[PDB]
Amino acid sequence: NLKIVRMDRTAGCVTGGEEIWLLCDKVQKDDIQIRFYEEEVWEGFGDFSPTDVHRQFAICFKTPKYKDVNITKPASVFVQLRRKSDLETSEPKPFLYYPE
Amino acid sequence: NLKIVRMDRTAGCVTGGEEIWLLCDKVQKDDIQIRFYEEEVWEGFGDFSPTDVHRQFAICFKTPKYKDVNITKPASVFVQLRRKSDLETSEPKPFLYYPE
C-alpha cells in the first residue's frame, strides 16, 4: 500500500537538514512519516509537516541527522514510508549518508 | 487553473538536460507542457513524457537548452505550465540559467 516511487536525492550529509522530495503512492498527510534506518537499529525521521505533503502524492522534507556526524566514509542506510497509525511500511530505498 | 506550487531547483546550466521536479495543481498528463521563456520571445520546453507526470500532481522533467550556451553571466528567464489544448498558462516562476 505504501510506496516510495522516486526521490530527487538519494544521498546527503550526516549533519541532516537537507531538503529532499519524494513521490509516493497515496498517503494521508497526518498519518505518514519517513523513516531512515540502519540495522547494526538506528532510526531517524524526515522533518516535515502535513502542509509539506503535496496532495497526498509527494512529500518535501528535511533529512534527519545521522547517528554519527564524525564518520570518515559514506554510511549506507535505508529509507521507508511508515504509517503512524498501524506502522505499515513501504519497501525500503537505499540512502547514502556522507561526511561533512 | 494551472499552478506551479514548487520546484526543487530554480536554476540550471545553459546546456540543459538537467532533471528538475515540480509540484503542480492537477494536470492531465497528455495535455501539459512546461515552457521556459524570455521576452527580448525565446521559448524552450521541458523534456518529459506522460509517464513522468506523477498522479497528475507532479512532473519530473529535464531542462531545455538555453538559447545561448556561450553566455558570460546568468540569464533570468521564466517558467510556466501550459496546456497543449487551449494554451492556458500558469503564473510564471523565475528561473536562472548559468554558464557552463
From Swiss-Prot, chains A, B:
Where can this protein be found? Nucleus; Cytoplasm
Task: Provide the cross-link position: Glycyl lysine isopeptide (Lys-Gly) (interchain with G-Cter in SUMO2).
Answer: K73
N-terminal signal peptide: none
Residues carrying Phosphoserine? S85
- Going by the entry's taxonomy, the superkingdom of the source organism is recorded as Eukaryota
Task: Relate the protein's function as given in its record.
Answer: Constitutes the active form, which associates with RELA/p65 to form the NF-kappa-B p65-p50 complex to form a transcription factor. Together with RELA/p65, binds to the kappa-B consensus sequence 5'-GGRNNYYCC-3', located in the enhancer region of genes involved in immune response and acute phase reactions.
| This protein's name | Nuclear factor NF-kappa-B p50 subunit
Per the UniProt entry, what species is this protein from, by scientific name?
A: Mus musculus
> What fragment of the whole protein does this chain represent?
247 to 350 of 971
